[PDB]
A paper describes a structure:
Murine caspase-11 and its human orthologs caspase-4/5 are essential for the non-canonical inflammasome pathway.
Comparison with the classic CARD structure reveals that, in the caspase-11 CARD, the classical helix H1 is fused with H2 to form a long helix that we named as H1–2. H6 cannot be observed in our crystal model. Although the interface area reduced sharply between chain A and chain B, and between chain C and chain D, the area is even less between chain A and chain C, and between chain B and chain D, suggesting that B/C and A/D formed homodimers before aggregating into a tetramer. Further mutagenesis experiments suggest that the hydrophobic interface is critical for the oligomerization of CARD and self-cleavage of caspase-11 in cells.
Residue numbers in the entry:
A (entry chain B): 3 to 172, 178 to 393, 431 to 443
B (entry chain C): 2 to 166, 181 to 333, 336 to 425, 429 to 439
C (entry chain D): 12 to 172, 178 to 422, 431 to 439
D (entry chain A): 5 to 423, 433 to 440
Amino acid sequence: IEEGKLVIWINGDKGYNGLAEVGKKFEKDTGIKVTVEHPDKLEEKFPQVAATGDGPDIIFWAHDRFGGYAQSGLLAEITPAAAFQDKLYPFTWDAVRYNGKLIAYPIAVEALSLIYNKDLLPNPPKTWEEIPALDKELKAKGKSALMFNLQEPYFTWPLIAADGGYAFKYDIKDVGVDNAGAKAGLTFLVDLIKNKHMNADTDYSIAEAAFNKGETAMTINGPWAWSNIDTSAVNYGVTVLPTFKGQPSKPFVGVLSAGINAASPNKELAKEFLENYLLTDEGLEAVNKDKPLGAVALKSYEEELAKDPRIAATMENAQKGEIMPNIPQMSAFWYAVRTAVINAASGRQTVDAALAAAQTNAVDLKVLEQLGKEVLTEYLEKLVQSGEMLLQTFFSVDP
Amino acid sequence: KIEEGKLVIWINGDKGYNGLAEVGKKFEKDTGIKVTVEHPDKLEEKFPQVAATGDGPDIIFWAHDRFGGYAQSGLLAEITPAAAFQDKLYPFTWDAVRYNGKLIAYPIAVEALSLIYNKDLLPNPPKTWEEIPALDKELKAKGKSALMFNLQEPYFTWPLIAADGDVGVDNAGAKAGLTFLVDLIKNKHMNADTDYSIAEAAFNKGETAMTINGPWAWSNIDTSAVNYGVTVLPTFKGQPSKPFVGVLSAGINAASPNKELAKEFLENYLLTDEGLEAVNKDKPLGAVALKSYEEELAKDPRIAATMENAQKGEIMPNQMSAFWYAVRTAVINAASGRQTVDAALAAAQTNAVDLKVLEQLGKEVLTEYLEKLVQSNVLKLKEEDKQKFNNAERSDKRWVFVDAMKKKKVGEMLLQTFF
Amino acid sequence: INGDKGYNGLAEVGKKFEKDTGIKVTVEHPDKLEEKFPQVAATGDGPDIIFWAHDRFGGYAQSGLLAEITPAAAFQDKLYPFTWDAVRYNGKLIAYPIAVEALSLIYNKDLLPNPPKTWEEIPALDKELKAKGKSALMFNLQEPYFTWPLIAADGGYAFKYDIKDVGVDNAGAKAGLTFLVDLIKNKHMNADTDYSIAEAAFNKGETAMTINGPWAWSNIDTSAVNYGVTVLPTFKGQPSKPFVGVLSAGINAASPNKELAKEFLENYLLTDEGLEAVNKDKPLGAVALKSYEEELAKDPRIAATMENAQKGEIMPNIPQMSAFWYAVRTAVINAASGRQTVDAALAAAQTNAVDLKVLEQLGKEVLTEYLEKLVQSNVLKLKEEDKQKFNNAERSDKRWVFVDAMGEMLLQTFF
Amino acid sequence: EGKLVIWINGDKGYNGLAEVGKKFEKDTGIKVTVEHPDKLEEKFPQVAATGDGPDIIFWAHDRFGGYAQSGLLAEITPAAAFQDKLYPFTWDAVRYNGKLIAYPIAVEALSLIYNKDLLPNPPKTWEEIPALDKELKAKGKSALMFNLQEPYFTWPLIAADGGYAFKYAAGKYDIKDVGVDNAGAKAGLTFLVDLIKNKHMNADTDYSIAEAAFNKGETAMTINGPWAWSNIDTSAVNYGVTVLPTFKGQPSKPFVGVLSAGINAASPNKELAKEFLENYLLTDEGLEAVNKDKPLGAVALKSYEEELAKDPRIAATMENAQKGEIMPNIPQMSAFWYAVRTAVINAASGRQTVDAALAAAQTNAVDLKVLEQLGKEVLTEYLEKLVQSNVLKLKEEDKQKFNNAERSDKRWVFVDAMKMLLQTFFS
């Protein structure tokens, strides 16, 4: 680790030079050089580059895959002014809340939104319960109402959690698929499949191909999919997700966050650059020019971009949507939802039996996984006397 | 990506891939079957993946070091070599390729360690290990050393370790060889930290009289002058040194509709007095499997020495851990001196069988991990592959799974988290 | 033999089997033979024959203690078909069925002169019997040996005809368990009635009918109740599936006389007076031999014990009672307490069963190599030929060959 | 609280601890009842984890360290002025992690016991043992017989020329530094087994074989502690104990255990002990009344040890304890006991050489405990599935208690929830 200057590590999602273009505004006005770098495999270098104290002082990544950094406790806290915590939506600071204090800075926001063909469906439904009758009307014209990815729990969980449902009780303690409100949401979904308003084999590609070829009226996707539906000429709107039993569908919210290192000796100067330069109207648009940040959580700027109705509804779904879990890497809980949807959609179990078995099949999958990690930890500790070769030694030929 | 009527062959860029191209189109001239010879971005792994989904080479060109993984997964078709064409290939050059009573493919080249000496520093090499310390006695007046080879890899050390004489790496004769190896180190005829880079760099500049290497090194040695000879490895106690012998073979896919014409290329065209030399012109094969034309090369005394060394050597181990790590740290500990030679052998043997225990409880825990994934049908894998998973016996479930996963949602991230 | 069946009653061969043959031999009953012979042949020694309950001989067959047995087609028709499947284990017969045991509906002829033949009569007829201060039916529900007959009454047989995880989530176990729990919500029966609470209810005489086999018969004799026993009620046109325990004679695999054990068991023990002599000391109950069983069937309860066993369920051959008992254990208590739905309780207990049995053999595997390492280091100084025996035993039974070597059993290193 | 309860092993002077304990009719007006349950050291941790048990417990110091990691005890509060009245090395014996744990009572170590009618002056070196046994074998006897099966008896000679169990670093016995493979460990070990291969000793002798042969006059010497003394006074031998012989000029180092006591962590009366201890038990007549019943051997206090030292047997016990060094407190000591012993057996059998049997034993030991922890974890996760499934009907207060306990002792907590499922892994 070095002192005298500040740095930044970002990928090719958002403009690598837009941040540079805002980068030298800092050093032009201050004199502290800010190098801006884009390491290949950023999410795979940081806990490596930081655990010994080296690396950046600040850094950028998402909030959904952020459960590998906070667990090793590295990102230092920030005492932002109350006047600063009032520049972004009050619910944004919870997405980067940990142990009680801060862990990074919100910049923008990402969430699933209801996408509908405006010519096929001029007024999209606001209610899940009215789509089966709507679909029957549309299948007589050769179309389907709603087609989105049923394979990944990321898309299907909002409806399963629509009735009094949410990921955690606030921290594991157990898998969160037990509540009887998920029975109601999962029942409705497996019905849309068994009554043939939906197919259980619909993946992301099939749902995307059906919408831009104009074969379906609605689909579930995020701002990342907006690029490919504009190549097609389908006239589409973007609105809030449909409600169920009166409660709104709440998707997962991914938020890019500007964390800063605890081994970082330029703590404050990193605050001055992010708070007073990056995180206001002038800084983001330098970033937003090279590549769009999507909806940004900064009230000042979001509203002027909220003139785009797609970006405004993307955020509206995010404010209601609940925060992407701090226990992730996509396992445990993720495994219980997916196996519950698959077995119930094919009719092997009623939904009551499916998610009850799928959840204890999840917790007992991770007692096997962590058991296997230990014997291999003991394996690895033995040959220390002398990363994928462990696959051909254990997936070898002989028994 | 499969096809009927073409032959596609894949080989490392180690080997002349142009040579096979040279032999390839001559095939399509006398026949009409257009052949394509590529050396894809690292074929050692890409093959098992694309084998399982059915595509890939019709003929795969490789050694019999790692064909364990290929035959038993069952996607390298069985062979039918006529008896009239048998009787030529060395009695032993198949034993290496013969797996599970049935033949996997046909061997081409044979590669083995050979004692490499220059003729400038000493005219005629010593034929046994025990006299090396005495000859080394007066090669330092000039300032030079007699022998430097790689001591880190068991591939080089094991020929001397087991030169004298489950069972285990700890035996009465393994002491003898190991004891002689480390006593050379304590007298500064050799150093425990000498690796492949140091040993080859010293001989190629000519301050070492003898080395132990294979024909893969001869390219760099030819390029760096040094008038050198190649002979049989030094004897220990009276028993010959037995190096690990790789035979480089030609596997053919089991998903290939053209398996008849795949042989037609290897049998009557590839392995001949002519087409063999065609690939070897651009790539030194060392010794070769055919006999009608192995002895042309045997005029070259360098290639003859490796053949005599290969006929005495063992077949490489085909399982890439345990015993290999036992011999490694047994040599490492005793060479640095911090543990007695017999203390190192005892400590190596218990770490080895404890390595295999810790290894195969992981394989049992692993087999349990995927038995749970197939049952929950998290994958939606075809009902055929799920019952076919449950039909296969316990040890091969791991392979039936991943071939029932390369098919297509992916469960490759579930498995790569397990490690 | 053991001390619960006839030692001398079967030792009376010297007076018959042996005289014709000139082959002197005779039994003796070591006490607590439960887990005591698993190793006298683990040598090649041991007796030629052993009798004991069919509970679990499969653990003593794949480990190589029981050879294949020779019943002729004419001799197999001398015993009931269902008892051959008791000792039939992976396609081979490893023993000779002698006597069998099963549940039966215990009626009494004063409250209800004609007992119910189906299960749906008892909710509707329990009414009559409810009011007057009693109850029509009640039995142990806290251990699945009693609850499984009705739960599995509609559906597949599971064990009669590979053994690992047939599964309890079948739609029939729903109908069985749903009907049973519907009996509790209508208060035809209460959720907390195990063995003694159920027997004391019938031995203090405030319930009409019960479920239990022959081992309890004497307790109803002493308490003044006039009862018989009959066949269990059918559930949805299909008979109930009570667990059929069998007493069978297996003959060792290292035995010297493979065919002399068969010639004696088949033509001398398994004949009318052969099994009789031991039935004189013993109420052998229902016997597998159709010839004599018909004469014991004068007792209408042995005929009912038999009839319930013919269509009954064969006892778990392997160590399945580790997962299955537990699978059908936790499924009932979680469902009867209203904590889970019948469907949620079945699939959970199903998957809870096979994933804890996986942990257990895994714990067996790491312990086996833990104990195996202890004998390679000679830390215990095992008299050597107590240690070749350990190294040459089957990788599974190796952990009990190690107990042979020297009661007291420490190992408390794990606890 | 209100009363004082004592646990002490049944082999000690437990009732001699009542005469001293019944003398509490002074200002304390509090009574004590001494109690001697067997398996006591096993039972205290499991019941004191729930907050019950005696106030003070007399036990060897080696297991007090395994207790205090779980916080089964409480902070000690000795004054530094009275700390000196004991022997300063005994304070390091019970000092654990940087703390105190107990108050020293007795010092216990091995010593050379000889037959004077057979052997008038003992040898002071191990090197002259083989020549002395050569003379006694001519007369039908042997020089030395002691238990070779347990490394506690063989450790003094294996450690003379610079052998140690775990190296004391700062306040801590270095666990990556094992001293059973040091130059003098080998020097002591071969000489131990050359005694066995030259037929001077025999690898089959255990404690029972040695004790009977020594008290029947069949051997001239034996190695034992103060516990075996009374059996030798019943014997017909005129015996005495003395220094242990030196090896290569250095004296042997026997393991020094101290019998001492603690004050329960959740105990309701912690200050009430401290007097019984600090002021009473530990006074000249305090230990005299328990040495009255069953002798304590060497005591940490001076003014009564000095009275005891006039009998040369306890003076030899204390002196052999001075050159000996304290037994570590740490769970890895069992891996030490396993490593040293399997090395002795295979070296005494000629099965392996001494350098070879030592190395094969050491990594056998830690590879064995690797399987132990792996066996404890699959067990721990296995019983978690048993209580979470409610198969054995508990919940009430016994279920969340178990689940809130830290994972490491989710076992002991579970089988003290037995208000049955035993060795099901042997089926």
